[PDB]
Amino acid sequence: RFGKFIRIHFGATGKLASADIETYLLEKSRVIFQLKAERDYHIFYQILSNKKPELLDMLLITNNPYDYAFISQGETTVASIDDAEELMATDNAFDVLGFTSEEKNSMYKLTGAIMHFGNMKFKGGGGGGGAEPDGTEEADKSAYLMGLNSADLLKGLCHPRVKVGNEYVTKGQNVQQVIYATGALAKAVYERMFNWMVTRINATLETKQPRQYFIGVLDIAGFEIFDFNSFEQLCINFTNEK
Amino acid sequence: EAEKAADESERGMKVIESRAQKDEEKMEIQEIQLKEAKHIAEDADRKYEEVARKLVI
Amino acid sequence: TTALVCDNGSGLVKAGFAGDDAPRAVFPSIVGRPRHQGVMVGMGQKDSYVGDEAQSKRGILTLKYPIEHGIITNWDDMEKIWHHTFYNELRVAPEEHPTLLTEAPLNPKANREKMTQIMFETFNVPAMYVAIQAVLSLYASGRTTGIVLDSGDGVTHNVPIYEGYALPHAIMRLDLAGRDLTDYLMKILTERGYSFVTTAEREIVRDIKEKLCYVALDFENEMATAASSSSLEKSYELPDGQVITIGNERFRCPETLFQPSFIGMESAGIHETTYNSIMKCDIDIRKDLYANNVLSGGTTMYPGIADRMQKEITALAPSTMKIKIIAPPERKYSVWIGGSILASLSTFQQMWISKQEYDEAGPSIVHRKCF
Amino acid sequence: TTALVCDNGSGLVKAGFAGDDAPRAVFPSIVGRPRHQGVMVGMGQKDSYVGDEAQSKRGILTLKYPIEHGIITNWDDMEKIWHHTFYNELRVAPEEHPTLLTEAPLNPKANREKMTQIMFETFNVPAMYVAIQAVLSLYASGRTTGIVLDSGDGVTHNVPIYEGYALPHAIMRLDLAGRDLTDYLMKILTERGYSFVTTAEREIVRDIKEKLCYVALDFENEMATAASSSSLEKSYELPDGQVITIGNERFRCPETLFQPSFIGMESAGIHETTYNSIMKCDIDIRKDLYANNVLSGGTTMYPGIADRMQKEITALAPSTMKIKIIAPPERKYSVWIGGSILASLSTFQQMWISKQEYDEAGPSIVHRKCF
């Protein structure tokens, strides 16, 4: 989906110097909303691989994909590629990379946290328009995961603070608005994770040679056509048309 | 004492809002049975009206 | 380019860019002049202090409000206010920013005509538009129906909107507002021993009203409780000392809204005007208006006002209707949020009154379909 | 292929594919226009709400019926109704579907000609046919003789048919119908203190008429009982509360059918018109016509109407003649059922008016012997 791009730089004397990598047009809608016959990103399915029980037990991840809301909406699984050895190879590649394993644990736990935002539930107040949470075990475990406070997070989601003039005021949020806010937060955090990963990879690949004129290489998704075209397909087609 | 009163307020609001959702459910179900009672009442009413007209004719 | 949303309001000017979640600049709409002589030579005091700065020098200035009830009464002061807002607060040139202005219903046409003339000539704004407070308040509330009660510092008005269609014959206006409440608080504080006369102390009384006053669910019961118990008395710190303790006067000032007869007004309370407005509209939309009652404006920020209003309306309305009152926490800035949303709409870009149209049709162009 | 059976009627359009047990789409025949201006921008309100949607927006719309008494007076509105019926309620393109229409006896020829022209031109239906609303009702009753009384919302008529042979000289038409009853109910409800003027609340008054009104077996006795006792009063809940109680007016509204003089019409009552029609025929078929009275149309759904009609006709008719009145529960949709039955007949497939025939011979085909 994402528009991978690689600029291969050269030296002053027309000799290979180093390479730079950038990403563009990463789609966030796939994270939350998936078509009926399509899957989500391979990350979540790979994480649910049972060959590593340590991650599942330390993240308190439910081994059943059906229970979770974000993934069960789309197709649960297909015989596309065996996720076990692919995940193992990705972990090995990260291990032989420049950064340590604490960071890998960080990405894994953050992905798990992204996974649990779907368990949030909210009930409209009986006497007020604003809606408050009903269950908090999922919120409690998630806040523990990020090292945040469950009460503070619930207050922020329910009662966002906004700056007006020179003073702070609280805003009211209903169930639909808080659900949209949670989805937007998940999409934004995933996008920031991907961008930070790309920057780290670029920094690791970077060598100390001078950067003269470069040669670009651009890979983009094609003009995909379905019988059930939707917003994501519209964006892809518009980019291809441009 | 301000903090003690804050704790008093918090568990008081918790208990009263639990009672509030309980009473909301109660009033909803009683309103449903109210509708059902009204429908059966009017059903019997006009059924008897029609049969009484049949009887008199 | 980007649109600019400014709300003159009354007693508080609030301005910002369109598409923002809250106005950037909020400050009192006050113009102050020095009343003393001035002995030090070389400091060179300016002859007019405008905006929040006048609050700092409140003790040596005669504060004047350019507007009494919506209507502008001192045009030069309004020009100074607008200049300060555009230059010293937002630090932007209005030469390249369309301006959306907010104006209350049922006002003299000359007011809008002069406003547009000043905007187009003095500041040369490329385009401008004028909107009604009620519509913006409904926009900010995420609603398309219901009756909105906007009660600011100048005037309190009720407007019913159903499915985006207004009911002009049912729009109601009442001149009772926050300023009258402050004046009544001054009049009722003197019976305890505290006298406030100077315009500088107007602000102190207003601050006391904001910080301590509250609306009573029942008047007689609260008065009886205060006649014996002393648990309703609260102390306030003046800017020099001599704390003052107020008892039943705290919940008697806001009762004027429901009991205008206190200050001699013939009209009825807001709770009754809302019901009358609802019964003015057609019979087929009264249920939705009852179920979608909206509040806006600073004066509606008193604690317990929503419950009292709901109780009164339920007493007036038939027992078979569910009366629901919507009181978002951000009542004061609802109008500006609605204005920002309106200005951010794409289909609104063709409704601006361009400079060419004003030049061709003169200042009266405001009263065409571009209402 | 399949045939569409559209029954425009008046005040209720009902349509559905031929061969179905019951009509698929039933909705009021009204066109609503917004009588206000609209303040909220970006909603993009349509300029005309048609069909059942107009019933949900009664409070901000003015409603007009395109059919006054059987005939069509506003052709644009009727075209809108037909388009909505074809493209929204049924969601079937009329390009490949013959249509069967129904209309009352003794109507202007221009009405039928223009209907045919519009249907062939605007919608380009492959073929269409027109029928009398009475013969279809007779079909739906599984009969072949007797008289049929079709009391709809616009017009009432009596059509005697014996052994499948219609008798044109004995067909009777009266303009009193449900709409006049609704108007009379609005007029007489004023004496109790309730005022209904707006067209929107005419629908409310129609709802009360449907729910509470009933036909009295005897008039003077019921008046005496109502004046003496109060057991006949019933209460109805308006859309905005204030339940209202109606007593003597309960059975006065439907009596206008037997007492036209209440509304000033000189014509005789329904029973007298039926009796006169019965004798307007020959003498050898009067017994069967007496024994095969058929009722159809919504207006004939009043409780106890059948008994009163039977009593009146028995009083008028000779004692030695058996009188029976057929009142199936589905009077309202009898006409559409009969039309569906007729369209499903194999022999009727040759009676359609082909588009080529209309083009060759012109709009006057329907009136010519190729009926």
Ligand SMILES: Nc1ncnc2c1ncn2[C@@H]1O[C@H](COP(=O)(O)OP(=O)(O)O)[C@@H](O)[C@H]1O
């Ligand atoms: N928390 C509060 N409690 C009581 N009154 C308040 C409060 N906040 C503001 N007000 C009153 O609201 C007024 C401000 O109204 P405002 O919203 O500026 O009206 P406008 O929009 O017409 O300018 C002030 O005069 C003040 O007395």
Ligand SMILES: Nc1ncnc2c1ncn2[C@@H]1O[C@H](COP(=O)(O)OP(=O)(O)O)[C@@H](O)[C@H]1O
């Ligand atoms: N149960 C009922 N009681 C009283 N009036 C009724 C009842 N049912 C239908 N009507 C009246 O019949 C009218 C509908 O007539 P309808 O059969 O639709 O005529 P058309 O076939 O010409 O449209 C409505 O105006 C309604 O007032």
Ligand SMILES: [Mg+2]
């Ligand atoms: Mg205001």
Ligand SMILES: [Mg+2]
């Ligand atoms: Mg009919």
